[PDB]
Symmetry: C2
Subunit: 121 residues, 2 copies
């Protein structure tokens, strides 16, 4: 499987974990030291993010990607993607479109998310 | 003097100075050819597009001030989240607003270069 196809598989696993609150998968796919920016402008850490999924207050019905734009930079892959989300998110009901940035990097053969952001469209 | 924080943020400060002064020559060095940036409209922007806006006289920012850096060092990469005050002319648009910038820097070809980022508007 080529590098682009590997990252697209990693993406599918990440989005499946998110949709199913599979915290065990997220613990492996998200790097401990990542930073995420959310629509309010707040910076979120891995701990905070996993705590939200573990809380049971995130219940997503659909997490649908399209229009991937990808750049491969040695052991790092930069991803831009359209994501449509339907479900319950904390005290918000989602039926919305977002543009996500994700940066994946290899850690001794394992791809992990080190940075990203969510922009409301 | 110069402390470790100053060293860590040296390329950040050069970038903000280059933005403020339309230093296209410095932007060519600091930005990686294969970066992707996401802007508030949700558009995905490339290095050439970003730099072309500064080259064309389309951007005239008076001041570019950072605050509230959050930094994570991950092997050959520095991930930065920061508030940036943007004041000036940006195309027809007069700005006097803060955005939350994400930047990912990689130590590549012997220097720190931006490989990814995004700009989040407040409101």
């Amino acid at each position: 499987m080529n590098q682009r196809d590997v990252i697209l598989d990693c993406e599918k696993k990440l989005l499946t974990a998110i949709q199913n609150n599979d915290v065990e998968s997220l613990e492996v796919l998200l790097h401990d030291d990542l930073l995420f920016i959310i629509p309010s402008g707040e910076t979120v850490t891995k701990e905070t993010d996993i705590a939200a999924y573990s809380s049971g207050k995130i219940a997503l019905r659909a997490v649908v990607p399209s229009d991937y734009i990808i750049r491969i930079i040695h052991d790092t892959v930069v991803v831009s993607v359209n994501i449509e989300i339907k479900g319950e998110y904390m005290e918000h009901t989602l039926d919305n479109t977002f543009r996500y940035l994700r940066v994946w990097k290899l850690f001794d053969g394992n791809w992990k998310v080190i940075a990203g952001s969510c922009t409301a469209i």
